[PDB]
Design an enzyme around this catalytic site. Structure first.
Site, PDB file in Angstrom:
ATOM      1  N   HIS A  44       1.134  -1.334   0.427  1.00  0.00           N
ATOM      2  CA  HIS A  44       0.234   0.282  -0.435  1.00  0.00           C
ATOM      3  C   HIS A  44       1.032   1.370   0.007  1.00  0.00           C
ATOM      4  O   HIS A  44       0.764   2.391  -0.598  1.00  0.00           O
ATOM      5  CB  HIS A  44      -0.626   0.402   0.809  1.00  0.00           C
ATOM      6  CG  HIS A  44      -2.153  -0.972   0.804  1.00  0.00           C
ATOM      7  ND1 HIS A  44      -3.364  -0.963   1.252  1.00  0.00           N
ATOM      8  CD2 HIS A  44      -1.952  -1.848  -0.286  1.00  0.00           C
ATOM      9  CE1 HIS A  44      -4.525  -1.239   0.693  1.00  0.00           C
ATOM     10  NE2 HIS A  44      -3.381  -2.043  -0.186  1.00  0.00           N
ATOM     11  N   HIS A  60      -1.267 -12.782  -2.357  1.00  0.00           N
ATOM     12  CA  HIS A  60      -2.381 -13.102  -2.368  1.00  0.00           C
ATOM     13  C   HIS A  60      -1.925 -14.880  -1.605  1.00  0.00           C
ATOM     14  O   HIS A  60      -3.059 -15.184  -1.323  1.00  0.00           O
ATOM     15  CB  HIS A  60      -3.856 -12.890  -2.536  1.00  0.00           C
ATOM     16  CG  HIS A  60      -4.096 -11.323  -3.414  1.00  0.00           C
ATOM     17  ND1 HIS A  60      -5.454 -10.892  -3.698  1.00  0.00           N
ATOM     18  CD2 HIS A  60      -3.814 -10.566  -2.333  1.00  0.00           C
ATOM     19  CE1 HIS A  60      -5.300  -9.671  -3.522  1.00  0.00           C
ATOM     20  NE2 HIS A  60      -4.025  -9.480  -2.392  1.00  0.00           N
TER      21      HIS A  60
HETATM   22  C1  HEM Z   1      -5.831  -6.421  -8.339  1.00  0.00           C
HETATM   23  C2  HEM Z   1      -5.187  -5.736  -7.668  1.00  0.00           C
HETATM   24  C3  HEM Z   1      -5.013  -6.136  -5.832  1.00  0.00           C
HETATM   25  C4  HEM Z   1      -6.828  -6.485  -5.304  1.00  0.00           C
HETATM   26  C5  HEM Z   1      -7.645  -5.890  -6.051  1.00  0.00           C
HETATM   27  C6  HEM Z   1      -6.431  -6.610  -3.786  1.00  0.00           C
HETATM   28  C7  HEM Z   1      -7.426  -6.908  -2.948  1.00  0.00           C
HETATM   29  C8  HEM Z   1      -7.108  -7.378  -1.952  1.00  0.00           C
HETATM   30  C9  HEM Z   1      -8.089  -7.079   0.030  1.00  0.00           C
HETATM   31  C10 HEM Z   1      -9.924  -6.771  -0.785  1.00  0.00           C
HETATM   32  C11 HEM Z   1      -7.627  -7.087   0.631  1.00  0.00           C
HETATM   33  C12 HEM Z   1      -8.528  -7.460   2.053  1.00  0.00           C
HETATM   34  C13 HEM Z   1      -7.926  -6.767   2.345  1.00  0.00           C
HETATM   35  C14 HEM Z   1      -8.308  -6.547   3.953  1.00  0.00           C
HETATM   36  O1  HEM Z   1     -10.002  -6.643   4.357  1.00  0.00           O
HETATM   37  O2  HEM Z   1      -7.730  -6.628   4.956  1.00  0.00           O
HETATM   38  C15 HEM Z   1      -6.195  -7.472   0.173  1.00  0.00           C
HETATM   39  C16 HEM Z   1      -5.092  -8.232   1.380  1.00  0.00           C
HETATM   40  C17 HEM Z   1      -4.255  -8.514   1.001  1.00  0.00           C
HETATM   41  N1  HEM Z   1      -3.050  -8.063  -0.535  1.00  0.00           N
HETATM   42 FE1  HEM Z   1      -4.681  -7.402  -2.268  1.00  0.00          FE
HETATM   43  N2  HEM Z   1      -5.059  -6.886  -3.412  1.00  0.00           N
HETATM   44  C18 HEM Z   1      -4.223  -6.594  -4.680  1.00  0.00           C
HETATM   45  C19 HEM Z   1      -2.925  -6.948  -5.464  1.00  0.00           C
HETATM   46  C20 HEM Z   1      -2.278  -7.691  -3.959  1.00  0.00           C
HETATM   47  C21 HEM Z   1      -0.594  -7.074  -4.077  1.00  0.00           C
HETATM   48  C22 HEM Z   1       0.045  -6.509  -5.367  1.00  0.00           C
HETATM   49  C23 HEM Z   1      -0.092  -7.278  -3.003  1.00  0.00           C
HETATM   50  C24 HEM Z   1       1.461  -7.794  -2.575  1.00  0.00           C
HETATM   51  C25 HEM Z   1       1.778  -7.896  -3.256  1.00  0.00           C
HETATM   52  C26 HEM Z   1      -1.336  -7.888  -2.019  1.00  0.00           C
HETATM   53  C27 HEM Z   1      -1.252  -8.182  -0.868  1.00  0.00           C
HETATM   54  C28 HEM Z   1      -1.905  -8.611  -0.383  1.00  0.00           C
HETATM   55  C29 HEM Z   1      -1.987  -8.940   1.419  1.00  0.00           C
HETATM   56  C30 HEM Z   1      -0.538  -9.346   1.907  1.00  0.00           C
HETATM   57  C31 HEM Z   1      -3.475  -8.944   2.001  1.00  0.00           C
HETATM   58  C32 HEM Z   1      -3.061  -9.092   3.476  1.00  0.00           C
HETATM   59  C33 HEM Z   1      -3.408  -8.683   4.527  1.00  0.00           C
HETATM   60  C34 HEM Z   1      -3.455  -8.996   5.780  1.00  0.00           C
HETATM   61  O3  HEM Z   1      -3.682 -10.328   5.241  1.00  0.00           O
HETATM   62  O4  HEM Z   1      -4.289  -8.450   6.806  1.00  0.00           O
HETATM   63  N3  HEM Z   1      -2.465  -7.360  -3.080  1.00  0.00           N
HETATM   64  N4  HEM Z   1      -5.778  -7.484  -1.207  1.00  0.00           N
END
Ligand code: HEM
Ligand code: HEM
Ligand SMILES: [Cl-]
Ligand code: NA
Ligand code: NA
Lengths: 712, 712
Positions: free
Chosen positions: B77, B244
């Site tokens: 982020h 993810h």
């Molecule tokens: C189209 C691209 C992406 C979308 C739409 C997306 C969407 C989401 C959403 C909705 C969450 C849940 C947030 C929450 O409720 O806590 C999330 C979690 C997460 N995303 Fe993404 N994301 C994207 C790309 C990425 C990328 C590029 C990374 C890392 C390089 C990433 C890493 C993560 C991680 C690590 C979490 C987990 C947070 C936790 O475990 O508490 N995301 N993402």
């Protein structure tokens, strides 16, 4: 673009502490306006300005081919924004050439006034400020039309961006009272710190209260707004009659003809505005107030014709060509000259606000004294003019050039000359040690020095430790200054003074104003030593002791702190969140957010709080200079909740046990709430930060002790 | 309290040029972040960080007792705000801790992430930026959970107030497209320079285009938004599947249980927000996005489970407990661990945007390759993670610490190492002499070295004169850069460089990159002398010449100036007024309002205008360094009006006669219209200001020549 101020309108605005940066200033960092101006040929400027007075420009033709009147309005407006409440506005910064003032309604066509002065500004350059020029031009206009000015002081350094000021809450220019952002409550109570009746007005409505043409009513507004701008009945009359001795109003046709104020105008207007579609839109067709009054028979000459017309006629309600309420002498001879056609002549005319000087009983005794004795009038107006245009310049030590009135006036909060040798480093040392040996506590020393030095405001450069006025009425009986405590501290300090001074050779001696600050310095060194740190706090002697007689007790009242975040002090409950009031007090003290933050932190742990309140005292080692405040504030291990008793007091409890560790105010807690403030608290709450906190704190301590020391 | 924005919203805002001042900065003005971080025990932090991974806190309990996933989303982020258009946002400045980013919906509960990191921040103080810690923590999250990172550079310095970024015009958080302030027009064209599909989101809607769950459409938004953050298809898929692979989403209950974002929270919440009234508010009850997805069997371990699950099930549209669109595997066993209760597993789930990696033709092929070759998946994600988090750090000389990748990456716009001895002062002189002897005009020399240097932006520290990329595709064919003239100038400079280098011994030589800047300086020395001033322009050698192969043509295209007020260049017609585009470019160039004023003044009179346009060339002695621009601009003798053909071009006519004197653009005139810029113009258009103006302009010239010179 959508901003943090759109999303989060009620958040603290810190940007106000960070104006006047080296970044916005086009002058070098080594530039000193005092040194520039003291090599200015003031005589040579005034000659240029004199020539100007009767050199008409076709784009703004001079009424009677003399601009003097225009330039007296212009200089009077430059100085007439000033509120005693906060010392904000006034001529001192040249803030008329910037938004919002440059585009107020009341400041209409003063854009042409300033534009006329460009070639003289251009000629003399950095050696005269716009801010000095706007005043000097008014003084030369008066001299050019046979009026003896009381003097002039240079040294108003130019600013380069708008002062951040509270002009009012109103979202419509000149909005009448009663609105969703009415600045009037109660029995027509104008809200602090405001000193005008309508958004974009200097003092009052020339047609009368919210346009109601009643000269008795108007006089209430005039008395109020003027008292709020430091001016008593006599000074008010002198200033209105003295000004409305010259030139004329402009209301040649409907206001609807007038175009966008300068900030709203086309780019091609090159900074001018109120472009008028009414005939030529200038000279004889000029519209400014929309009123058409010409007061005297010699508009371009000092007379006593104003009070003659005023008293020598009866008066009838009439309407300017623009539809504006004004008065005209009933059955008078066309005695008053046209401004442009020598063949035409007009009856005498008056504003409601001019009749005020007549029909208000108390104004009328003053108006009649001045009528009968135009030499009394001419002296009052001159003194009033000096004061008006120099109210916000600060101590007499700032006054530059060869026309500084040698007469010391009471409103200048005067500091006696220093006739005697000052104390040296060895002396300061000896005296600090004597202060500590006395048994005065860090908390007493630091609280006193703070109460003394913290009355300063860079707004109008009033207040500060210099002159030891904390020992005098009314400073010495202010709630915030803990009167009875103050009494003992001062009684003790004055023994040390008497002893030291009694032992001295060569007529060397120390002011009580020097010793209060020396003592507050001793207290900060002791506090550092208490935290196992040996620092020397800087000290500059040369303050002197003003007498009760050299101190106007009424003019001192606006300097009373009723909010001091730095002493967790609120005197009453306010609309304004305490933290907003903190940023205010910090602005006035000239402090950056980093300086505000390090300062409040140290003070809390030094026991500077009013009534030795525990609120914000986040230390087990009080009277020790440490960064305890921040470490403890930013400790996630504590949880903060508003009390049942007081929503503006908070309990900090251990998140685990629920044990009460700390209490605090919005002023304390904002340092761990505000994104940008927390960011600063973090630096001083960090493990590597004990040296930098102590160092920064002594710095901004010394800065506040020296705020009013222009003699250096 | 009504402000200057309220009255005059369309008025230029110069405050964006006067942020990041020494006033708001709590670090001493000698403080060097590089040298604090060079003394930092990077190992000791990473150790403290690893410990943190599984040290759960009551107030935000770690999913699966490991915070790694939360901290990877916090890193991503921080870096994920970046737009290529202007290089603004990114992780380079730790801007996540400030409004508005700290309070964006898509940064919900990341306040908690940062809060957990305080004690480490506190421990190591100034020796690690927040900006460096947010990324480092992301890296250690990945290392903790068994993913080897490509590496890590420190030296992101902490900022101390919000960067001034246009994030959009919408006044409702997350507003769907087609609104009064839509960032979308036509066939779903996102308006430059925005890189997100809704206000307060990083890239796309996880439910899909404006909350419609079509993963094929979602794919388009992802391809777009990521394109706009410097990332091709391969890097995009690597990054979404990379991320993810870890942790979960949080949608335990309806979003209406979630309260005020940090900036809106009460003071007692101490800079945290989104306090939930659902159950415990946290852990198993966490609401963040209102989606409830876990992607892998091992959320706390690097797996190849993501693509496995993705390809390994058909997917069925369902609703999170919050009512949000998500996907659940058809007739799959509960193989997915609950984060808090061992007695519970769940079926595999995906976001609409996760399924995009499958159901988009182009993404499917890269997803399949990664499924089939998990060694390529790992390497791609490691490189794309290093690029995401280092994209906006600028050239490699800025990279600090022991963990910097030795491998030089095309995206870093790499600069070859200087092997040879540099030109000395004797050599510079001889080269400037040959430049001037060549018969290159002042205009040619100043135009070229401006064209080269002024591509630079501190937003993402890309561009500048280093690399002589002006001699390459695409810079050499840009319209602003006058391709044909540029051709001839470079042609001649290369002959001089070839001659000089040919003469040399010891293997000394001069880069073309140096010589272009040297000649610009020679140009400026010649223009001073044309005006009868004796000036030397400072010149630092050490630039090197990048090859075509070392220059990504596509990535260079966001650095093409479609607006340059400093060359009175606008490529077409923009909704945004040119004077805003000038300020915009000044900020990008790290220029103060004074520096922008001085620079544009000199350039105008030096012949730096595109196509040799007269627009703003207010002088009879073109190619001479004078303050002519200012004196002539501020001449009240001249009236200005918009032309019939172009509202955006203006005519300067004698106020008396009607004779055309000048023509200017909005960029030229704004200096005569804006009250703060006119204040600045006046200083340099003054009669005492000819020397100051030359010195101030040589200073800002040499600043722009040195903007990308971190190698010093
Ligand atoms: C189209 C691209 C992406 C979308 C739409 C997306 C969407 C989401 C959403 C909705 C969450 C849940 C947030 C929450 O409720 O806590 C999330 C979690 C997460 N995303 Fe993404 N994301 C994207 C790309 C990425 C990328 C590029 C990374 C890392 C390089 C990433 C890493 C993560 C991680 C690590 C979490 C987990 C947070 C936790 O475990 O508490 N995301 N993402
Ligand atoms: C209740 C207080 C005051 C009121 C309501 C008032 C009102 C006005 C108004 C409405 C105008 C017409 C402006 C125009 O149309 O161009 C005016 C002009 C003027 N006022 Fe005041 N005024 C006040 C106090 C003063 C003071 C204190 C001074 C000077 C010490 C002053 C000096 C002038 C002068 C010189 C002009 C004429 C400008 C010119 O020659 O064009 N006034 N006043
Ligand atoms: Cl200077
Ligand atoms: Na003031
Ligand atoms: Na950036």
């Amino acid at each position: 673009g959508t901003s943090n101020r759109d999303w989060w309108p009620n958040q603290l605005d810190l940007s106000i502490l960070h104006r006047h940066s080296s970044l916005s200033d086009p002058m070098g960092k080594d530039f000193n306006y005092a040194q520039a101006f003291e090599k200015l040929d003031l005589a040579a400027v005034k000659r240029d300005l004199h020539a100007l007075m009767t050199t008409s420009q076709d784009w703004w033709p001079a009424d009677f081919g003399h601009y003097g009147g225009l330039f007296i309005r212009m200089a009077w407006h430059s100085a007439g924004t000033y509120r005693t409440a906060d010392g904000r506005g006034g001529a001192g910064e040249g803030q008329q050439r910037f938004a919002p003032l440059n585009s107020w309604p009341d400041n209409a066509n003063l854009d042409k006034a300033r534009r006329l002065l460009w070639p003289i500004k251009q000629k003399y350059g950095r050696a005269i400020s716009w801010a000095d020029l706007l005043i000097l031009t008014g003084n030369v206009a008066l001299e050019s039309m046979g009026f003896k000015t009381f003097g002039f002081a240079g040294g108003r350094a130019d600013t380069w961006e708008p002062e951040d000021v509270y002009w009012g809450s109103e979202k419509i220019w000149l909005e009448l009272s009663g609105g969703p952002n009415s600045r009037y409550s109660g029995d027509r109570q104008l809200e602090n710190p405001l000193a005008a009746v309508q958004m974009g007005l200097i003092y009052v409505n020339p047609e009368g209260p919210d346009g109601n043409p009643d000269p008795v009513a108007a006089a209430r507004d005039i008395r109020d707004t003027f008292a709020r701008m430091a001016m008593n009945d006599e000074e008010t009359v002198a200033l209105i009659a003295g000004g409305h001795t010259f030139g004329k109003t402009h209301g040649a046709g409907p206001a609807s003809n007038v175009g966008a104020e300068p900030e709203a105008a086309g780019i091609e207007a090159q900074g001018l505005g109120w472009k008028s579609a009414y005939r030529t839109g200038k000279g004889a067709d000029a519209i400014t107030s929309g009123l058409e009054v010409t007061w005297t028979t010699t508009p371009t000459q000092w007379s006593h014709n104003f009070f003659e017309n005023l008293f020598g006629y009866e008066w009838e309600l009439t309407k300017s060509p623009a539809g504006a309420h004004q008065w005209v002498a009933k059955g008078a001879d066309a005695v008053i000259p046209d401004a442009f056609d020598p063949s035409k002549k007009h009856r005498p005319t008056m504003l409601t606000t001019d009749l005020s000087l007549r029909f208000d009983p108390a104004y009328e005794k003053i108006s009649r004294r001045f009528h009968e004795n135009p030499e009394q009038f001419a002296d009052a107006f001159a003194r009033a003019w000096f004061k008006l245009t120099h109210r916000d310049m600060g101590p007499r030590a700032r006054y530059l050039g060869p026309e500084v009135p040698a007469e010391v006036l009471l409103w200048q909060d005067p500091i006696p000359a220093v006739d005697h040798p000052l104390i040296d480093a060895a002396d300061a040392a000896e005296l600090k040690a004597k202060v500590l040996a006395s048994g005065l506590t860090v908390s007493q020393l630091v609280s006193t020095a703070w109460a003394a030095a913290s009355t300063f405001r860079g707004s109008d450069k009033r207040g500060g430790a210099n002159g030891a006025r904390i020992r005098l009425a009314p400073q010495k009986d202010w709630e915030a200054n803990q009167p009875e405590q103050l009494a003992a501290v001062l009684e003790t300090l004055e023994a040390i003074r008497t002893a030291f001074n009694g032992a001295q050779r060569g007529g060397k001696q120390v002011s009580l104003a020097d010793l209060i600050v020396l003592a507050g310095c001793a207290g900060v060194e002791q506090a550092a030593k208490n935290a196992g740190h040996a620092v020397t706090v800087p000290f500059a002697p040369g303050r002197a002791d003003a007498s009760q007689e050299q101190t106007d007790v009424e003019s001192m009242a606006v300097l009373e702190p009723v909010a001091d975040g730095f002493r967790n002090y609120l005197k009453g409950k306010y609309r304004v969140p305490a933290e907003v009031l903190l940023v205010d007090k910090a602005q006035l003290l000239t402090l950056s957010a980093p300086e505000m933050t390090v300062l409040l932190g140290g003070l809390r742990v030094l026991g500077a709080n009013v009534g030795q309140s525990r609120h914000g005292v986040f230390t087990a080692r009080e009277q020790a200079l440490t960064n305890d405040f921040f470490v403890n504030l930013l400790d996630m291990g504590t949880e903060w909740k508003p009390t049942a008793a007081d929503a503006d007091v908070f309990e900090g409890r251990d998140r685990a046990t629920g044990e009460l560790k700390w209490t605090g105010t919005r002023v304390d807690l904002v340092f761990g709430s505000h994104s940008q403030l927390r960011a600063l608290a973090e630096v001083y709450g960090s493990a590597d930060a004990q040296e930098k906190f102590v160092r920064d704190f002594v710095a901004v301590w010394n800065k506040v002790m020296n705020l009013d020391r222009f003699d250096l």
